[model samples]
Target chain A: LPAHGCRHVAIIMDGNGRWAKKQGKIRAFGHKAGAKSVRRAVSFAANNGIEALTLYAFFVWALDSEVKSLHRHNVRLRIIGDTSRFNSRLQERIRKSEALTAGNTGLTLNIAANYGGRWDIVQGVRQLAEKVQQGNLQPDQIDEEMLNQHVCMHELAPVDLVIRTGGEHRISNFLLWQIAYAELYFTDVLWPDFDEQDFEGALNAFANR
Target chain B: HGCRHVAIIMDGNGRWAKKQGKIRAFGHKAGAKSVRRAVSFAANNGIEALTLYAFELFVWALDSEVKSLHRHNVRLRIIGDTSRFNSRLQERIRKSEALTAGNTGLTLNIAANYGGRWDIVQGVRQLAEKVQQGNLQPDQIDEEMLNQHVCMHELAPVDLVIRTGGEHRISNFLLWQIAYAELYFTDVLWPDFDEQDFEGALNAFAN
Candidate 1:
């Protein structure tokens, strides 16, 4: 699906480290709090007519339990990034979530766990290299389009708004090429505390530009 | 102070002009002051070179017939679609380039009518043309080839990217070049951006 005149959003869900500072005995507290914000933000996305939501979350997590909480979402859920680094049990759970919401046509939600933008490009090029090795394509024939076809979310619109919370002003190599022209919004609000207001603020900032 | 090259998106003259109740073109005219601020500041700040993002104008590049890059020592490059220029403007671009081609001093690069996507496309075009002949093989064109052919590949990698007028978007400015550069955004419009604002950004980069 080619999305033109569509609003695609990417978020760097940072600043939870502070919440974790006080909260496993408190771990549960921080996790619960963040989970609450995530759901609230989902409700906000649906209500606000957002087309898609991509959350850069969970560098690593414990089994299917972490993802089981999201099964209630009525949106199409995609797990982006390399999954070979993950265990088969967890990968199976991820696929289940995608299939569970496969019929979801509301908001497209993406979870980028164990993902790095540099790795994304490297893998895309690696695929192109294989094609070249097979003599199916030539190096000179490779263009941005050729590369873009191999990138994640090539079927969707480029990221229009990238919101990073917790006072950071860097991309940290998340969705890099897709966000080449994205309007970046940085906030100090921390992940647990980020809410509908924060998302609305970011949306407004994006609309203003 | 450890910065080598600087990339800037001269923005906000339109917003600044709105604040003054004037038209955007009037604001862009006033933006020339900020350009002077940047040029003069680079020399005094020990910054070796700078690039001004010039949109919608024909830009230049090195490897042109115009030399004196060694005489002036500072390399000058116009990294955009030069085909749009008439022969008269092309001659002026070449002459103007040879004028300030030296570096042990402040070097300036102005990219006119350039986008990273366009730059990447032009680079591929160059390689594809070569591939049309028998000398080069298809697989020979690699990321390394694309990297080498991209505009202004010879200059130092950008250390800091500063965008003016509070907008925090790439706006199609130097996408391929700013892979890891620290991005700094300020609310001050371009027409009002001064040496103080310049130092403030440098100081933030320092910390």
Candidate 2:
């Protein structure tokens, strides 16, 4: 059921605001629609036996509302970004959401909120630099594998497929380190409009590749 | 015109040559012609920099290519770790770089022995050295700090990244610099990529 051996999928949920603006509605309206698509994507990945599904939501929506549903589905939820920058209440919600499904074995759902690829590397390097300052590591020992161990989502499988919707063919600073060898899939379909079929299309492309 | 810097992952040389009932080297030679066309097009099209990912021989093999580019006023730079290379090859790289160092036209960067992760690691090594020497604190290491150390830092960040040969992967090409780049993946093989293909990528970025 899994598309080939593709285990991890990352999505850039772009153009929801633009999509909403075109429809003469507030941006949050389109995000609501995108939230539905998120559900569809999670369900599809779960059914397909995909191990990890990462969504780039630059959504307080899913965290606020879909935590229980995801927990019920046995989905292990993780917010993989610098959550320290968020408000205290929001950070508390994330902690609770993650704790609620900490033992779930169905699928690992990673929500990347305030994340940049460069920021991820910087944070990892900062950890190593701290170790070096403490005299635990050498300057020359900083390598790719060592940096990989510190970046976000290191426990999950390497990203197998990256789908960037909204027609723009750009990484936009998403998972630069983890996706060093991941297959990239770009489409013109906006976030709100992306559905199970769109996700399937991406998987199919990955399988073919 | 909107793109100041462009990077290409010239792939499928082997496959393209296989389809033509030829050897992989033949396709590579054919792809070299495409590189010439790309340089000419980029120079004329106002592209500030053009980086081509190549996975190389010594400078003797590249000597003719360097001279051809030098005659055209194109700046040639080989961006990657050349420490593992032979001393002669290393010396020739320095010679070629100095020869075109003053070129005022397009900057053609040939990424040999380069990987995006390797580039990041090299930059991190620089930061680590500073931290080890007490010149900079560990917390001071950030994106801009790493940027100043990575290859091609002096040039503008890659605006457009094209991967020819039907592959939909970055293949570890310029990851940090291509954060906001418009990636173009085409099925056309590297040897077959022409002015029209290059033009198509630019137009895709424009509109």
Candidate 3:
């Protein structure tokens, strides 16, 4: 990591279902395996002393299996999206995960579940508008700080590195506010097969650059 | 459609300075030269309107020394929230606007102390006040009415939104007006942004 000096890594965990299909199994099976990848990533991150790890796990994928499967892992998860459209069960699951992992001292794992970049911005704007209407925020007071407060994940610092699997270079609206200066990495590795070695290889490639 | 009105988010000034092993103030001064080049290019290209995202509403976030340096450049009309800025900077901004008011070659708009959401709210407030004063009816306040109250509302909608320094997202710049504008992102630093680079942008628009 000498050449890149990358500390924080954000990734778009894409093409899991497709990879599962190629293996002649159900998409749900791929998702279950994807959870394993998340565990591995969390373990690796906690061991590596990285500042933060943001993973893109779509909202629909969480409900693919019974809540028992995800809850059994004891992972701290934050669902970064519009929870208004979600059912109560998923919301409860999210709340439980957030509460359970709220005090973890290790690496922060941010999961973007049921979230879109434009949606994040729109919601942020709505919150800002609400604050302004309540007279808590003056018209002259609205700025980047106000905007950042509206976004769902503002607890962490700006992301320094962004990595996307499945060979896609586009951001697809991941962390819109926090990735202004992030160094981006794109790899062709399928999500299911990506392991610690693969992760280290990406880091090494970034180091060489 | 070719961009008749182009708005740019000039970012990465600090990063550019760090890369050059120079001070951030030096980068800002160098960025001013690029602004000059952009204005001249717009005039020569017959672009009707150009807006540059110059300063945010929170100008106090910058160190005092940087703010002092930014107060002196007197070109282009500065539009946006002026309340937060120091009074001297406000006056300097007004003087610059007056100087460029009569220029017919190209309409240059500099968004100093600006916020996109605030611009919308201010427009709504103006409409409400007009209704209260009986100058306009509540029903008369439509999309066009709100559009008219926005900063630089007289100009056409932005046709292209350009961001230099390799950034891909639009950060609170012209949120309303650039609703349908094509975005062009570049890796070239603002100080290095020149006529050729501007032409390349135009050519990209052509395709």
Candidate 4:
């Protein structure tokens, strides 16, 4: 980790359902296995002294199920999206996860469940407007720092590296604001099969690049 | 306001004249007018520095006709491997750069043959050479040092990057400089990218 200068790692975990299908299993089953992979990654990152780990757990699909399962694991979770669009149970789970991991000092894990990059920026603008209205902040004070302060993962550091699985080179709206200078690593390995070795391989590739 | 630098990726030259059933050379000639317009516009706007992506490196590997047209627009500092160009083209490049050396209104920088990766590699090489010559130390080589050594390091990081012809990718522009630039994409063809369109992009950036 020190050799790579990687303080934070962000991942866009893709191709879970496809991996499950190839193995003759259901999508839900694949998601469950994918959760295990996430746990492995958390352990790897924590042991390696990585300060932050952001996982794109859900976009539009898998939000409810993924958050519910992640909450049961006592993982520190931050839901960075318009939660009003979600139902009450998911919201309650989100609050519970936040409350549970509020004291965790190891690995500030951020799970962007039901989040979009554009949505994040627009919501940031909306919140900034509210602050301006309350006389707490001025419009002229709004810069990159202020914009970042209004983001959902404001508590965490900026992303240092981004790893995308399933061979896609595109960002797919994951951490669009924070990944400006992050080293991008793409792997064809499916998320369910993405282990510590695969993760290290990506890290090595990033070091070389 | 004093203007020191500008860089532009003159894209979609082939597509611009293709729509009118004209050859690609016609489009290239038409794009030359755009280059002149840009230079004049920069002069009017008090801009002292300018860079343009005039030719892609891969174009030389193609047929002679395509290569000949690329060899025509010879002006400003050409930042690329000059060995690929023919002897006559190389002489033409020297003449163009020499002619613009004394221009007081603006330091026009035309990137006739350029690539971002090539720039980075060349910069590193130059830095290494300086270190070997005992002129610069390894410890002194920071971001600022690297920037100063780069071909167009004097220019500001791109505040806004505009891509016309409906493309969404950067297509290998200044990779390091445009790290945080606000990108604006439009579907307007190259010839159709007039003052109003430019104004629209500027207005969008102003927000």
TM-score of each: 0.78, 0.96, 0.57, 0.50
lDDT tens per residue, model 1, B34-77:
77668778767878778888422323333342353445455565
Tens-place lDDT digits, model 4, residues A1-209: 47866778889898788989998999988888888898799778777777788888533454456555544544455666568878887677667667766666667777776676645644655555555545565445565566667666776776777887875554555665566556667678989899999988877776675
Candidates 1 and 3 compared: the better one by lDDT is 1
Q: Give lDDT for model 1.
A: 0.71
Label model 4 with its docking quality class. incorrect
What CAPRI-style quality would you assign to candidate 3?
A: incorrect
Between the candidate structures 2 and 3, which one is better when assessed by TM-score?
2
Candidate no. 4 TM-score? 0.50
- Regions of model 3 farther than 4 Å from truth: A1-8, A12-47, A61-74, A96-107, A116-147, A164-173, A180-209, B1-33, B40-49, B53-92, B95-107, B111-191, B199-207
Candidate 4 Cα errors over 4 Å, as ranges: A58-75, B1-207
Give model 1's docking category: acceptable
Q: Of the native A-B interface contacts, what share survives in model 4?
A: 0.00
**Which candidate number has the best lDDT?**
2
Order candidates by DockQ, high to low: 2, 1, 3, 4
**For every model in order, what is the number of clashing pairs?**
11, 0, 1, 6
Best by DockQ: 2
Minimum summed lDDT over a 10-residue window in model 3 chain A is located at A66-75
Per-residue lDDT of B125 in model 2 = 87
Query: What is the Cα root-mean-square deviation between model 4 and the actual structure?
Result: 16.8
Question: In terms of docking quality, how is candidate 2 classified?
Answer: high
